[PDB]
């Protein structure tokens, strides 16, 4: 029994949901970083983006 695992190069992944904008699948951090995306996102997509955020927002408070 040995260990070939070292952990010398790992991208700290972040739980990021997918929010579609204009029918195009973008990530949450992607949609939030692009004001044009939310500006070209439909009410449904905006509400979806907002709702998806509330899910993560409800997982804070600490």
């Amino acid at each position: 029994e040995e260990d070939e695992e070292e952990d010398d190069e790992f991208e700290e992944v972040a739980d990021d949901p997918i929010v579609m904008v204009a029918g195009r699948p973008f990530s949450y951090s992607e949609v939030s970083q692009r004001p044009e995306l939310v500006a070209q996102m439909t009410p449904e997509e905006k509400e979806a983006y907002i709702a998806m955020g509330q899910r993560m927002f409800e997982d804070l408070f600490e």
Binding site: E2, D3, E4, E5, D7, E9, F10, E11, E12, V13, A14, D15, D16, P17, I18, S27, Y28, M52, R55, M56, D59, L60, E62
Partner: protein, 108 residues
């Protein structure tokens, strides 16, 4: 594999958990891995207890995927599928990262 009939996301094989060759199963609400041909998974974590992730990018010959749970446990899946390892890791990582918020429960 749950009796509740969950939406299996991705079935990865040749997934070595600490030199243990098995498969990484991303299920609807839980990520479970099992070796070779097993019915009962060896490692079962729920997207609700997972805090964040860590993954070996393209600078790694060994395709690994670390899961940082809220419990204070981090498991690194060593994918060895010479043909899909990277993509299966990236896939799992993708699905993992995207599906996390669905069950994400900050218990730490």
């Amino acid at each position: 594999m749950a009796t509740s009939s969950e939406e299996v996301l991705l079935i990865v094989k040749k997934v070595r958990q600490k030199k243990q060759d098995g498969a990484l199963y991303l299920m609807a609400e839980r990520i479970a891995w099992a070796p070779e041909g097993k019915d009962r998974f060896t490692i079962s974590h729920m997207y609700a207890d997972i805090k964040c992730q860590k993954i070996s990018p393209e600078g790694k010959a060994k395709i690994q995927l670390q899961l940082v749970l809220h419990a204070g446990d981090t498991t690194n899946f060593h994918f060895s599928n010479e043909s899909t390892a990277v993509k299966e890791r990236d896939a799992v990582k993708d699905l993992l990262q995207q599906l996390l918020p669905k069950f994400k429960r900050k218990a730490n």
